[PDB]
Amino acid sequence: IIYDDLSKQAVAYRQISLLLRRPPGREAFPGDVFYLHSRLLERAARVNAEYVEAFTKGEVKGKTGSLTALPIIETQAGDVSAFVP
Amino acid sequence: IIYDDLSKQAVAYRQISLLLRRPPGREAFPGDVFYLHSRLLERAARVNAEYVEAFTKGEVKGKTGSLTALPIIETQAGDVSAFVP
Amino acid sequence: TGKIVQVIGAVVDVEFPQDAVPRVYDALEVQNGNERLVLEVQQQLGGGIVRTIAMGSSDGLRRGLDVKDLEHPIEVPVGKATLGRIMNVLGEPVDMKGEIGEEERWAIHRAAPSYEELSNSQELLETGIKVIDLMAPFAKGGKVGLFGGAGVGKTVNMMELIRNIAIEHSGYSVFAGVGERTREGNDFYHEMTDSNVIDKVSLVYGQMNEPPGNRLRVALTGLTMAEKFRDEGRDVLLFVDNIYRYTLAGTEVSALLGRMPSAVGYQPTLAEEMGVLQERITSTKTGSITSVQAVYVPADDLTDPSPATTFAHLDATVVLSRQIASLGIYPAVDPLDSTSRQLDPLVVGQEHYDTARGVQSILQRYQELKDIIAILGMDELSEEDKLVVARARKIQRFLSQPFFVAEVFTGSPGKYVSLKDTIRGFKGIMEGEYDHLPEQAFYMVGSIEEAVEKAKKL
Amino acid sequence: MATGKIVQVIGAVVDVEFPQDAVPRVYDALEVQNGNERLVLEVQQQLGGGIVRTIAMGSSDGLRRGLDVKDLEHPIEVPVGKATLGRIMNVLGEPVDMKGEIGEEERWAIHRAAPSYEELSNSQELLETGIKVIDLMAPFAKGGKVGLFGGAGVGKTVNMMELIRNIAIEHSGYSVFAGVGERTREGNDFYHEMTDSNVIDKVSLVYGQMNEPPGNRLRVALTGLTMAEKFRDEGRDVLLFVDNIYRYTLAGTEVSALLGRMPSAVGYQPTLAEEMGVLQERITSTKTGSITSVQAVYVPADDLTDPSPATTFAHLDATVVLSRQIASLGIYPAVDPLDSTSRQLDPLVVGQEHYDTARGVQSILQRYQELKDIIAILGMDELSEEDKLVVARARKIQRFLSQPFFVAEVFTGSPGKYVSLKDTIRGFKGIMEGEYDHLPEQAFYMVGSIEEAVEKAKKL
Amino acid sequence: TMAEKFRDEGRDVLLFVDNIYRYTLAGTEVSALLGRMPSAVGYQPTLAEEMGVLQERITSTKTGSITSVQAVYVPADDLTDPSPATTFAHLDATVVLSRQIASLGIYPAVDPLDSTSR
Amino acid sequence: GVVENLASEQAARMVAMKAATDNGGSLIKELQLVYNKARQASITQELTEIVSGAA
Ligand SMILES: Nc1ncnc2c1ncn2[C@@H]1O[C@H](COP(=O)(O)OP(=O)(O)OP(=O)(O)O)[C@@H](O)[C@H]1O
Ligand SMILES: Nc1ncnc2c1ncn2[C@@H]1O[C@H](COP(=O)(O)OP(=O)(O)O)[C@@H](O)[C@H]1O
């Protein structure tokens, strides 16, 4: 999976949060902006054979599965120390 | 009297002040932060014998009382030019 | 008649019957245990509530205390009865002497003189100090500001100007202590009494010790005395111990007064509050005020609003640099930032004007070379650039001077330098008359004769 | 009987109304049915009118207004003691491994006062780690806080497993590891490497994953610290590993922003200095026993003046820097002896012999790093016969800082060594005094103590 | 809307816009009075939505083409600033005029190391 | 005499280039401390403008 401009996802969620009148944080992003990306990216995982066997109710036995994520971020002036980056 | 880290007293007062929603000034310290330190130190003094005689109700005569003070401040990166220093 | 209904720090809200609500800037009075507290009215809220600032400590105030409405503003003694005595913001005596033999009291809140009343003057006033009257000379009846950070020399410089000006001048003087050190008030009082010059000086003190409300108003108490002596037709000297503290005491109360913050958290009214104070310190067709003000610069940031606003108010501005002071060049005046309205060929005449602009041009060019020198070192410079540096360094040293009030620090005896000796001296250095002396010869010598005698012994 | 009802749900922040005579105290734990699982809520504020304000210790999705709320009258309570060892738990103390229920004997509330002035110990004592570089150049106190500043590739976790092993075996202590905002992949790797090493029985693991809501990632440090306070009371001396003290700070910033307190300088929470003190003051030496802590540190922009570093540095006693440049030499542990420091390294604390030895090594390795410039710019011909001697000794000093770890045996294929503080001092003092000058420099690498270097030289 | 009428007829039209920045800056003026809390460097929270809704109409369909040239004010030449930084994504060719070159008087002052095209 | 002067130039260059490298290093540390202040201030200044704008 490739997520293009996760920085655009963060800008959209900032707009939603400020119109819903929820308290602003640094660079006006809401307090839980880390929780937005972290719970997204932690889903990209490799899972063991016993999880796949349990999930499929044993119709698949020998295989692991995986989801690999390539997120994209755009820095403004090589400033990697901006909040979302 | 030694006051160790009047820098930490300022940080404590800033916590109390921001929890009380008081508008912050330079850095994030309240405008009151000068009055905080000044009223503390300005008590350190040498007082003339006429004051000691008036305070003691004449029981002590001809002696000048004193209170020296050594406040301690901590500068980041040796920067003497910060607000609290 | 009134009731206290809130107490928030220095601010007290009072309710009155709606037929009787106090005017703005009226004085109120309340008994606080075993003492009387004055409150000054700042705002009328709705419903007969009025919002006020305590002229004293607000601790121990209850809600529900009865408040007395005095029918007038804060009014202070003025005239010759004040000379020689120390007074409080409320105009009370603070020396241990008796009551002040007032004949008249004036309200501290006043309008500035009208545009028709103002007077021009170009009489240059001489000082003992080589850099000041070379680079930023000033006139009788003008305003001078000393700008600097913490510990750079604002007080010592003002104490030389008091020593030099206010003792060859013959008229009365007013010294206003505003939010500064109490020790330095006591030290000043004595040497005035030891010198028997005290009987020409009125002193008002509102030091840092005091609660906000005192530090806010005490500057106006000082001007109101100086305005009495001016309107009497005298020529008066006003010294203000730190003008920055007036603005800061406004910042401390402004949020409690319910005003949205501005800029770097300053009160929104900062320029009006400063302007309404500053416009009263003016010489007039009836009489003159010469004024010297110290201006603290927070965090050495000359671009902060409070310094930035003050610069337009003043006729001569002398800017003190921590970077110079840590060389140990004193007075730590920056000549590339210090400036005066009087540095003009018509008033100073051409020799002075040309000498000042020459010094300014060499020292500017030395700033342009310092970034080369820092990476490369000097050996890479051109042989004319090396001569510019060799002169500029001598100029920087020759701007240094021993002060009579500074003798307690350097031990060395002080110097008073005539203006003619300064012009002749710097003109000779820039012409290269002295290119054979070492730099050490110029440091802390009063006159150019003293540089050559120091050079003989290196 | 449940007595509250939910009245707002705004993200992670949940407001609950109680009867006025029943309002929870601060930090009390509530629970609710979020459909078919119980969700815990921790109380942050008592508002007016019986309303309380809480952070959800789990997913907030699917909560309705008007759900019933059970007021557990304690704080969050977690299992403690021997039953925790070798188990992985979440912040609530629930097992995150599949390995069944924890055979708890007690549950302790995670919110506690630090030891009082009369309970604190009346001594300052070094924790002998057995690791030559650390014990000489960056000595730990009992009750100390230690910062780890190295990056990645540098041996950081293997160093953690060696400390865990020596404190369990060569002392009689135990460890707790608190994963403050771990990467779930790295938490899985670390658990298997502790099994493969066989140090897993020695240490208890509390893990707060990044995918967790901010309240979980903030409080997980206090759960780990609470299990360490149990072991300490038993009379043991204990290690507490905090896997990134920076993420504890950021979790406090996220929670206080969700609560909507006014932010502070650089945007941190206004409570920043107290929240660090609340954690760090519990980690101390008490008359009963001590907890010593090793904390990974991150510097927000390599800016050392930023409030998070500046607050953390006030609490650290020692700083240990791991560098890839030394790992390139094959020297392990890859600890830089010149940038690592310890405030305990003072004559009045370690004594003059130790102080002079460590100052000696520091001065020789500083000088060698100067002469390496000359050897490059001008070559070895330039170098005097005294300067050749300090180079020849510094290479021997540098290698004698190497040591084989019991947990690294599968890499090195050589059995681990534990070196006592007296032996390491005696070794480096030896080389500096110029006895042992005549051995090959490879006689010192990976050997152990100096008594084994003379055995290695006899056959090398 | 006039350009879209000519496009839907099936004509090929040129659209010139004298400054797109001042459309965004006009949103900022009212946005505080419309009760929205502010974001970033004072910009309205809706900045990317307002920019996208306008820019996404200026396209060439199967019936007709719109070719457009837009001037973009860059506050203090800081190409970091959210208003110019957001519009860069909507264009196809972007020409960057630099004061650093313009200071030398060498017009057209196009920076070759920053200008680009699809 | 020419050859011994040429040995003197290459030696004098190395000594002077060594100093520059050190002096450059000082300039970098100074400037970085200035920047870390400018960075922290710009964060604190704009966040106050945002929070005070919730009114
Ligand atoms: N001309 C001078 N000669 C020698 N020392 C000086 C001179 N001027 C200033 N100093 C040194 O600097 C010190 C502080 O000067 P001064 O008290 O005038 O500073 P300031 O600007 O008033 O500081 P503050 O803002 O704290 O009041 C003096 O005590 C003295 O040590
Ligand atoms: N005592 C040792 N002997 C040999 N190799 C070691 C020793 N200590 C650490 N290493 C090296 O550490 C490397 C792995 O570093 P590790 O601690 O796993 O990195 P991380 O920071 O990702 O945990 C391995 O290549 C291993 O060779």
Ligand SMILES: [Mg+2]
């Ligand atoms: Mg002063």
